Design a protein around this ligand. Sequence first.
Ligand SMILES: OB(O)c1ccc2[nH]ccc2c1
Lengths: 211, 216
Amino acid sequence: SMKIDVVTIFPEYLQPVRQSLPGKAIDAGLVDVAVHDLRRWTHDVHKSVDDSPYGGGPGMVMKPTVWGDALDEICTSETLLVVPTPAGYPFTQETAWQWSTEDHLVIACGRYEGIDQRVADDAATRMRVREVSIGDYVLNGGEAAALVIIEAVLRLVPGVSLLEGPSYTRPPSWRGMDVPPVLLSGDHAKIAAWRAEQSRQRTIERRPDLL
Amino acid sequence: SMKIDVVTIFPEYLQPVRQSLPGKAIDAGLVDVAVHDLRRWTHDVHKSVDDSPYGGGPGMVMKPTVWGDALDEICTSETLLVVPTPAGYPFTQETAWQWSTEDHLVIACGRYEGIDQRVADDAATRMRVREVSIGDYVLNGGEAAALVIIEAVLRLVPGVLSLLEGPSYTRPPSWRGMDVPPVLLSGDHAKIAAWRAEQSRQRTIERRPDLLGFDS
Ligand SMILES: OB(O)c1ccc2[nH]ccc2c1
């Protein structure tokens, strides 16, 4: 089984992924995803979660005292703490496979300007911490990245190179375009070879880095 | 103003667009986001959107007929049609800047093993089409990728407001016995700039050496 806890100031952002888990998976206790409003751990009447950056500059930095309290409550020694950030290590399919066998993921969603670095650094002294980027672009906050990570990981939990080439289905002719006849040939070795060439061409065109 | 139409068999998944930055941009009238149920364009009682692949293989492929009808209605020749796919060109910060200037994005979200290739090929005879991958991982469908693309693009549109950013800090100056780097408290703009530039380049070599032209 896997437990995922997500901490965010926008808990409703995660609601359409809880309502996305099959009832059978939950009933079988294979998965539980819980979302927590970071403001539960604020200290002041204004429910402050960020503050101006030391050393100056634009934006705000999320408060270590608030995050520290939240993670103290939610995390245990077994936790893998995931922090989405454009400054992270790359999150890849390999990462997804690795995390798919974890018992407890906690995903700390913050603004891209960051969570005070002492939060992750403190957490790393008693649990595993992974700061990760889902791509080479900036998002305002970590919530959409959390959705991507949750989906990529959970689809690898049972019951919860080259690029793929083009796919086709009925009808065989549509708006003047025919399905490649080789796919209708019943020559399955030839079909495999054709698909391999399609994959090669597409990878050269779109992702030459992979070669 | 920008218009973004999203087409999906799971319109409820696109509800998060009402949150955070996209929500604020919508309320500020800088963008209109409309989500459409692809099944609106089916005609059978079963509302089928998929069929087995020609040539074999696991799973199902989304039918071109339903998609063609949907895109016929929603798209114009000025539309930028965005198709998330793990087999797409990379979506990068440069892409986000480029698309931030667009009048009309339509994001076609696939499921199963993807969409019959003729949908994109047909659309390309009438409009610009972009098949894009948001990263090197596989999702179950295009919906989460649509959210990522919308978030990355909208924060760049006029009026909504390389290397890795290094660590950031805020009050208190000491916490759990961990001190904010003294230079950040020193008020010396030059020394702070230099420390930050250095932290940025150091984090980059460790986490993203590719950005500086190194292996891995
Ligand atoms: O970018 B994703 O990995 C992605 C995008 C679109 C998709 N359609 C079906 C799976 C699927 C996966």
